[PDB]
Amino acid sequence: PFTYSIEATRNLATTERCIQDIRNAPVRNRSTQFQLAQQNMLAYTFGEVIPGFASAGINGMDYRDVIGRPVENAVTEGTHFFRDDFRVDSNAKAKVAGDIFEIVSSAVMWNCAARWNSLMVGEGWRSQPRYSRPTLSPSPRRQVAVLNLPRSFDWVSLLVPESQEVIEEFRAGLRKDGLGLPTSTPDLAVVVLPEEFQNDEMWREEIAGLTRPNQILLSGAYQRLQGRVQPGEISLAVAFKRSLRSDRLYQPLYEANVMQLLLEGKLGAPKVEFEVHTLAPEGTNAFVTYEAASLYGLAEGVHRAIRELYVPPTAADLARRFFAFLNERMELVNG
Template identity: 35%
Template sequence: MPFTFPAAPHADSQASVCAACHAAGTGCLLDVRQVKNNRSTKFQITQHRLLACAFESFTPGSIGDPDPTRTFKAYREQGYKNLEEAGKIIFPSDFELTTAQKGKVDGDVFEMLEAAALWNVAAAWNSFMDTGVWSHPTLKKPQGAVPTPKRKVAIIKMPRGGDTTQLLTPSARAEYQAFEASLSGRGMELRLSTPDILGMRIPDPAPPGFEIFDRPIPNLTIASQQRIERALDTVRGAFEGRHFLFAIAVKTSVRSDRLYQALFEANVLKYILGYVLRGPAIRFYAHMESLEGADVRGRYSAASMTSLLTGGTPTRAIDETYQALKPLETSQRVLDDLPTYVL
């Protein structure tokens, strides 16, 4: 299915495609009119199908994208436009979809678009690490990059409510559990947070299955989305504290009453990885599409508690607040950082 549909009576017009898709039970809209849930909602968006339909032939901002310079917003708006047209085609007399309904999936759609683009950053980097040849047509080779297979990376979308400790080797996890048990005995806890995206140094030699991070995501079909979402199953139990490079909190925007969530996550992550698991200083980034509605840059200039405790030069808890407007620019920003990690 195309990102933009040709006009009827073309065989691939949206009327033809959406009707066939709905008849096959693979449509992007779920009819809930008969569900007695005391809600006024008539239709629900099937997020994975929405993405699979709009991006069947390319990943936004990556190889194969006819116009990789577009914004995250432009990609999503076209997807929603396709969705609303599909509703009018399939349910011509009763279809309605509110802004609030789109808002329920918008953050997750934004996160998937960024996660796919950054997966492809890792694939481009790993290819250069293996071959010493930079051949990517849209991303530029980062300054200072030295090819060596020992510096390959995995950029992983973490599941909502996931457990970061599942990434740890048995010995590293035992260290964390001993720390957790000592606090629990005093009626306290300090649990390792789960960011939206984690950047990891692939162990050398790479465990079986890690070759998936050498292959780019060519599109956002259901199979491609599953590859991104199930990456945790591949890397489970493979990492020590020293393998964590960066974490990213991904948001379209943030309310003022939720500003401190990312600061708390950053401080906890840096303390546990740096002190309990004795890894290098992980970097924590906030990637936000909109900075309006709250003093994001002001609040996110807060110092890291761990850096203050050491008595050395203070650093920020959130190392960079980045306005993520375009997949290609966001990809290049993350790629340019990869040569700067010492270990």
């Protein structure tokens, strides 16, 4: 559970344990002795808790401490079972922490999407826990989907074929002269739910935890939407970075710039909203970096590439910021 528990932990099967001893069955070409089982970790620590949608103690807790709990629980497990034999590299803890930050934050934005959708579809505004009721007038045509995008994803595969053919035509044009414009992905995309699904129920059900099924439910979600989204219906893009360094700033800025070149400049959509979430910005230089104008719009004919760098204090605040974003962004979508 969120708070470590020796019993909860002995209840776990060997393959469900947050630490996976691989000393005697090793990743070839790696010294890795113990594996941080991040899915197992999300399961144990957040099996019953979606921060922002849980106890007041957790929703109001410093988000850094929320995101860090999985690794602390795993570290405890490892110490119980292996005592001073327990060694994980800091890069292990780095990788897992980054992935937890993204997944949990996505999960919180998922539940926000549920509650908002439920409201848009003329049901109630739920209220355990309580969040100031959104003011925008409901309509099922402005439900949103929260898509944590997978490793390797190409966000272009979200777009309706007609939009994809526009980009493909444009890139084939470049490829003849040995040039390109590859797209990768933000970590997460909030998109306007396709009509065809506006009556589907999964998009309105808040999950209770990041149990393996719900992890799957969440990380598979993008599949349901591939090929179905209009250019102007990609509402928000997010990059998660648990901490920043000056060198680790650029992937979102670059990708936001390309999203704009393509969605705005080639497909006539409105401002592409792309933001960066961090728990540890390490000075103020990132905030200045992200004041950069969108390059495409500059050199042609104007706003910033990255709308904001957000440092969520608590899960509740991330939930609040997103509702607020939806209330405000979804009034470009007609009821």
